[PDB]
Amino acid sequence: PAYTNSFTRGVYYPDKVFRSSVLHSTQDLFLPFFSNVTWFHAIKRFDNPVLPFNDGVYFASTEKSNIIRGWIFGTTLDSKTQSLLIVNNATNVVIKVCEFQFCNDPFLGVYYHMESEFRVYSSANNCTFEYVSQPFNFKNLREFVFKNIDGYFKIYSKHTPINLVRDLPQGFSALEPLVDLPIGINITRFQTLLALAAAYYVGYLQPRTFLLKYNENGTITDAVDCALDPLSETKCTLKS
Amino acid sequence: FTVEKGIYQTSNFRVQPTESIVRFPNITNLCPFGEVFNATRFASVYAWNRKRISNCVADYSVLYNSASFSTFKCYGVSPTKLNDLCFTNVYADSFVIRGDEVRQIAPGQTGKIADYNYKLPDDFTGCVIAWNSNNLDSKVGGNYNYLYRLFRKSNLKPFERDISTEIYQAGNCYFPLQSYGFQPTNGVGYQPYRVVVLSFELLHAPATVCGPKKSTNLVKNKCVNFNFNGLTGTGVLTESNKKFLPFQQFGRDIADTTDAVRDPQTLEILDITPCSFGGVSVITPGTNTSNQVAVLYQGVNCTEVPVAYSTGSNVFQTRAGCLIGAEHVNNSYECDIPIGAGICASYQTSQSIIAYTMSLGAENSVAYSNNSIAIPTNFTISVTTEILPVSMTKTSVDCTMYICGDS
Amino acid sequence: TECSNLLLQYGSFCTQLNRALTGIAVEQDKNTQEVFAQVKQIYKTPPIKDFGGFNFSQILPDPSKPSKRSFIEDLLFNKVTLCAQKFNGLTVLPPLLTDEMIAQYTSALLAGTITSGWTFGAGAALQIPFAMQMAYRFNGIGVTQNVLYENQKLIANQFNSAIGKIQDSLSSTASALGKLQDVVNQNAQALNTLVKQLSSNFGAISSVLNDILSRLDPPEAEVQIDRLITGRLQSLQTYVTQQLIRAAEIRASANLAATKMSECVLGQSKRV
Amino acid sequence: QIDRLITGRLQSLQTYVTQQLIRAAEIRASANLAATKMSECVLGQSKRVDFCGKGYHLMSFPQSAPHGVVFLHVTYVPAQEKNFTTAPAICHDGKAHF
Amino acid sequence: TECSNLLLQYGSFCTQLNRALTGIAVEQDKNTQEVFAQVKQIYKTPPIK
Ligand SMILES: *[C@@H]1O[C@H](CO)[C@@H](O[C@@H]2O[C@H](CO)[C@@H](O[C@@H]3O[C@H](CO)[C@@H](O)[C@H](O)[C@@H]3O)[C@H](O)[C@H]2NC(C)=O)[C@H](O)[C@H]1NC(C)=O
Ligand SMILES: *[C@@H]1O[C@H](CO[C@@H]2O[C@@H](C)[C@@H](O)[C@@H](O)[C@@H]2O)[C@@H](O[C@@H]2O[C@H](CO)[C@@H](O)[C@H](O)[C@H]2NC(C)=O)[C@H](O)[C@H]1NC(C)=O
Ligand SMILES: *[C@@H]1O[C@H](CO)[C@@H](O[C@@H]2O[C@H](CO)[C@@H](O)[C@H](O)[C@H]2NC(C)=O)[C@H](O)[C@H]1NC(C)=O
Ligand SMILES: *[C@@H]1O[C@H](CO)[C@@H](O[C@@H]2O[C@H](CO)[C@@H](O)[C@H](O)[C@H]2NC(C)=O)[C@H](O)[C@H]1NC(C)=O
Numbered sequence A: 001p002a003y004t005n006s007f008t009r010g011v012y013y014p015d016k017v018f019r020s021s022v023l024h025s026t027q028d029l030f031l032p033f034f035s036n037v038t039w040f041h042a043i044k045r046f047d048n049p050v051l052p053f054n055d056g057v058y059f060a061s062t063e064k065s066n067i068i069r070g071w072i073f074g075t076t077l078d079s080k081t082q083s084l085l086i087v088n089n090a091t092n093v094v095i096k097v098c099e100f101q102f103c104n105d106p107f108l109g110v111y112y113h114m115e116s117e118f119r120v121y122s123s124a125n126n127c128t129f130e131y132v133s134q135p136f137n138f139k140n141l142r143e144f145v146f147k148n149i150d151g152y153f154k155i156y157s158k159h160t161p162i163n164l165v166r167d168l169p170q171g172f173s174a175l176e177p178l179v180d181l182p183i184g185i186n187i188t189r190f191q192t193l194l195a196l197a198a199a200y201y202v203g204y205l206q207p208r209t210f211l212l213k214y215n216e217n218g219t220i221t222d223a224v225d226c227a228l229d230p231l232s233e234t235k236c237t238l239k240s
Numbered sequence B: 001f002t003v004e005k006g007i008y009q010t011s012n013f014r015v016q017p018t019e020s021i022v023r024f025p026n027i028t029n030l031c032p033f034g035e036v037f038n039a040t041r042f043a044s045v046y047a048w049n050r051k052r053i054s055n056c057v058a059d060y061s062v063l064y065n066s067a068s069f070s071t072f073k074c075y076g077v078s079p080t081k082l083n084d085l086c087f088t089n090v091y092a093d094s095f096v097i098r099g100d101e102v103r104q105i106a107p108g109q110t111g112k113i114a115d116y117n118y119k120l121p122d123d124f125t126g127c128v129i130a131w132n133s134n135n136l137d138s139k140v141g142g143n144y145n146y147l148y149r150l151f152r153k154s155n156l157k158p159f160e161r162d163i164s165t166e167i168y169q170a171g172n173c174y175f176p177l178q179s180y181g182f183q184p185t186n187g188v189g190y191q192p193y194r195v196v197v198l199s200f201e202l203l204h205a206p207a208t209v210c211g212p213k214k215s216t217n218l219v220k221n222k223c224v225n226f227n228f229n230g231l232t233g234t235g236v237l238t239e240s241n242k243k244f245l246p247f248q249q250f251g252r253d254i255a256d257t258t259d260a261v262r263d264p265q266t267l268e269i270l271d272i273t274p275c276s277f278g279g280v281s282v283i284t285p286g287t288n289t290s291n292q293v294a295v296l297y298q299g300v301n302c303t304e305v306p307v308a309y310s311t312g313s314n315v316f317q318t319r320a321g322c323l324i325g326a327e328h329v330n331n332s333y334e335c336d337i338p339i340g341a342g343i344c345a346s347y348q349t350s351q352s353i354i355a356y357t358m359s360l361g362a363e364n365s366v367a368y369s370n371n372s373i374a375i376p377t378n379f380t381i382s383v384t385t386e387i388l389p390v391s392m393t394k395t396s397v398d399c400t401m402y403i404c405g406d407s
Numbered sequence C: 001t002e003c004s005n006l007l008l009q010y011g012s013f014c015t016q017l018n019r020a021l022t023g024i025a026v027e028q029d030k031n032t033q034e035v036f037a038q039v040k041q042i043y044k045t046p047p048i049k050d051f052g053g054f055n056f057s058q059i060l061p062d063p064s065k066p067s068k069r070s071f072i073e074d075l076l077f078n079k080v081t082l083c084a085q086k087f088n089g090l091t092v093l094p095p096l097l098t099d100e101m102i103a104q105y106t107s108a109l110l111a112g113t114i115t116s117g118w119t120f121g122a123g124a125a126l127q128i129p130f131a132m133q134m135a136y137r138f139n140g141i142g143v144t145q146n147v148l149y150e151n152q153k154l155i156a157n158q159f160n161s162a163i164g165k166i167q168d169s170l171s172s173t174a175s176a177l178g179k180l181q182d183v184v185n186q187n188a189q190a191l192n193t194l195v196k197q198l199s200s201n202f203g204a205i206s207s208v209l210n211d212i213l214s215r216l217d218p219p220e221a222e223v224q225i226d227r228l229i230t231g232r233l234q235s236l237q238t239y240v241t242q243q244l245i246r247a248a249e250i251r252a253s254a255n256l257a258a259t260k261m262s263e264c265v266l267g268q269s270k271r272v
Numbered sequence D: 001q002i003d004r005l006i007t008g009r010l011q012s013l014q015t016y017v018t019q020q021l022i023r024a025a026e027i028r029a030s031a032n033l034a035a036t037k038m039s040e041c042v043l044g045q046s047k048r049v050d051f052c053g054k055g056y057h058l059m060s061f062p063q064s065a066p067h068g069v070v071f072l073h074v075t076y077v078p079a080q081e082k083n084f085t086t087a088p089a090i091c092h093d094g095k096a097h098f
Numbered sequence E: 001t002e003c004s005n006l007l008l009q010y011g012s013f014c015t016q017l018n019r020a021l022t023g024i025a026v027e028q029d030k031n032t033q034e035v036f037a038q039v040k041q042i043y044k045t046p047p048i049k
């Protein structure tokens, strides 16, 4: 597996509270600064494992031509227990929660000069939640953070233009929340959905304290990891 | 019973909330109660359906208020409190039974229907809704399309559906299912009676089904008891130039207090200014000197304190609050009773309390010159007193006796 | 109302706290009075500023400014940089002596000094030429008058240059008024902590009385509200105690400042 | 109930003792000032301005008071000033006289 | 850990306590400096007494 460095990526708004020209300290689940984010490359290569989903997962994909389509969330993934399913197809996407008979290697097949193969499960029995929205080098960066607290599934996202070939960009940009779903199921493992040169990185969130800097506009323009180094510890201690 | 000259703080002043307003998001998505109840064809009693209801509002404005339902009884809560009680996944079961078998639907009831095809547990907490549907499910030749389990090996457990059509051995071979003789000429109790039961498991998952949340009109520039999406508080709402992000709802200041909220119906930002308050101080000379007093509402406008000595007849807006009962004068004297921000009050001539800007002293211009000196030709021997505390009263307190005397 | 009735069981803690906080404010007013109100009359410098070549222009009042404050005084006021807390029963009473009145007292002291010497601090202000007063002070430090009378130009130039250097030091260095900035910061931080302690559970289910009351029945609500009451009362008591200690320190400083005014401005001190 | 009463009464006693300690510190400062005033005004003549009363200090007399001391400061106050023309020095024979 | 988490519910009481103790500790050094560091020049007596 390939490892790369997530410099200041993975910062999201922890709550729907507006703060102007203040420095706020939050203790939540964040991706640590300069973390050892795992790199997966799909070329030749079609990386699609069953990567665990513990204490949230930071997902970033320097994607071109819209290759990444969705993710699988659940604990067993064999219709024995309820599972969470998201596909961002070229339609009004269904975030659908049923007991799916997931196959060994789920994927989407697109004919190279349309999507003709969907290949995700067999039986959509015992359905409970069917939210629907957004009817549909590397030039687009798609950063995603998935959290599962007390049955509330939270997703944060932010799209920023990049012009980098095969590495995570350096900079700061906070991920705004876009959905919040009361699925109410346990999640242990997760798996991305790959459409048949695209690479995605999977960071893992940990409970840390961050010093978020809000400007007069309410946007988080900077952050400090209160456990990266003694200088940042002093910055957090002085709240400056 | 006597009070010395000075200014004394008394019970504080605070503007009371004029009214209470509640603001909640638009009630858009409602549960498919219309489809559940007004379906053209209902299921049979032996094959009672089970439709799941979730992520919707379960308002009963058109259900409970309607007289079309001849039987409406909830075993766990009242219909009045149903609309304001949040719930979880709701299962709707509908069937058509005989009018005399409606009583069997109650928990802990007997009967062939209750013992063979539909039993409710004794801890049932949901709602059972039934009404006559003779004209809807009655056929002149007998509506035999509806069947009931007449024969079975043994009593069935609650919340169980039986579909097996195997012949029941009485010893003596009988088909377990028999058709109902529903006709328009049937008497009351034998006519078909459509029944819908609202059963739901609660307090085991995040709440996805909740009742309607009524909201009132929004008032501004008035101290009210607001409630924005469950964020309660008291203050004065005013339109603000703050620019929230689209996903943000509340605003918090540097001290972690809510000072700006977004109205869930019309997306606008309202500044939350606290209702005006402040201590009430009473300016008084000695009791024997006079019995008239002046009141001070510290840090309070009396374009506003009349809302609460509301007549006035003598008001004065100062920087330390505004003063009621004291006459403002242009003359400046030595400070007699301090009020604040350079304003002092005194009792003078007819006699009344006067408020004035205190004077620092008599103005003097020294006759300075580069060749002029002043030399005293005399002297006075001055004797003045200085008083200094040296000690205070010794006090010994027995901690044990004070806390737990003799015990 | 429920929390208020529960608070009634604790006695006169709130009355004690308000009494302490009121004594602190009265002591602050007394501190300012003792430091500055040391002049019987409001002396004014003569229109002709013929003080023997000494330049007091930058410490004397400037009429152009609405607040008749000296150039150095306005420098200091700009250097020391300083509603929200009001939501929770926290008020800031204004001081009795306004800034303009304190500036008037300072101007009276300075004019009385530069026009009389030390006579206004012991009786009626007796005028004396400023060079002659400086000769008196040279005698006070043990140097004969002829030294001043023969080096008057040099001494005046040295004094003027020193005042200019004071101007530059104040207008460049910001840490100079560190003590005043520290007092302001300490008070603001104490109030901020007091407000922020209203968001603590203190062991209860929630920090919001409305949430407790709504989600609990009256007796369990009473238990949780009692937990919140204990926490908030402890926070208020800690704030009041630390304010009393800080007010004691400020009173010591104010007494020192009053002594310094009396012994250095109203006279000449032989204390090293 | 006994524990609730104990907690309340113990907190009351702690508050009393803390305020008494603070007031004792203030009274100690006042007593130190009074002792300094005794030593420097009663036992001698003080040149410190406005220390032993307003004016030019001559002497002080102590007087005992309940839980305190009263100082009678005897001072010298110039009374009737006159206007005079003054000069820093005098020219006599080409020499300056001070 | 359990006791620390329960103590976190009390706010910044112990942060205030730490600040007060640190202030006292710094003030001790300040007192010593004010009393003794009066001259910024280490004079030494001549060998002849
Ligand atoms: C005693 O100390 C003072 C300094 O406080 C001496 O006065 C200074 O004397 C020097 C030389 O006379 C002056 O420097 C001159 O400055 C002028 C400025 O125009 C310049 O043109 C000359 O070329 C020279 O550099 C200096 O200004 C002056 N300082 C002040 C404040 O006036 C004094 O000379 C010393 N006297 C004895 C007996 O040591
Ligand atoms: C000392 O002198 C000033 C004024 O100087 C006088 O000017 C002429 C009138 C003449 O009499 C000179 O010999 C004097 O030296 C006196 O100040 C004046 O006091 C009066 C009344 O108090 C007042 O009307 C004037 O405006 C003042 N003039 C100024 C310039 O201040 C001062 O009273 C004299 N002091 C004593 C003890 O006699
Ligand atoms: C907060 O939002 C406003 C509006 O976008 C920003 O103000 C703009 O700043 C840019 C850069 O100069 C200008 O081109 C726009 O004309 C401004 N618009 C308005 C309405 O003023 C503001 O910059 C944002 N705050 C920050 C720190 O960027
Ligand atoms: C099922 O049937 C009717 C629709 O015709 C609904 O009841 C009507 O509701 C409106 C509004 O209150 C009334 O004006 C009518 O008088 C009602 N008519 C009857 C026959 O009730 C009813 O709410 C629908 N409800 C469900 C749950 O299906």
Ligand SMILES: *[C@@H]1O[C@H](CO)[C@@H](O[C@@H]2O[C@H](CO)[C@@H](O)[C@H](O)[C@H]2NC(C)=O)[C@H](O)[C@H]1NC(C)=O
Pocket: B301, B302, B303, B317, B318
């Ligand atoms: C008490 O209320 C009045 C009315 O708001 C305030 O009067 C202000 O005076 C100026 C004078 O030009 C007006 O332009 C303002 O519109 C008035 N309102 C405000 C908010 O300033 C008055 O300020 C209030 N009292 C105090 C001490 O502020």
Ligand SMILES: *[C@@H]1O[C@H](CO)[C@@H](O)[C@H](O)[C@H]1NC(C)=O
Pocket: A003, A036
């Ligand atoms: C990140 O992972 C690689 C894998 O070998 C390792 O060499 C490197 O030391 C790791 N860096 C950190 C900060 O963990």
Ligand SMILES: *[C@@H]1O[C@H](CO)[C@@H](O)[C@H](O)[C@H]1NC(C)=O
Pocket: A125, A126
């Ligand atoms: C899931 O599966 C079984 C039958 O497949 C069903 O009886 C059960 O009720 C289902 N669980 C839920 C919550 O509906």
Ligand SMILES: *[C@@H]1O[C@H](CO)[C@@H](O)[C@H](O)[C@H]1NC(C)=O
Pocket: A184, A185, A186
């Ligand atoms: C998920 O797993 C945990 C672990 O036991 C369990 O307590 C919880 O009830 C499970 N929730 C669901 C919806 O299966």
Ligand SMILES: *[C@@H]1O[C@H](CO)[C@@H](O)[C@H](O)[C@H]1NC(C)=O
Pocket: B288, B289
């Ligand atoms: C107040 O005035 C009355 C006269 O009616 C007098 O008896 C009393 O002694 C006075 N009290 C004080 C403190 O002066």
Ligand SMILES: *[C@@H]1O[C@H](CO)[C@@H](O)[C@H](O)[C@H]1NC(C)=O
Pocket: B329, B330
């Ligand atoms: C006091 O001052 C105001 C403004 O200068 C003036 O309008 C008023 O007339 C004065 N009071 C009296 C009784 O003249």
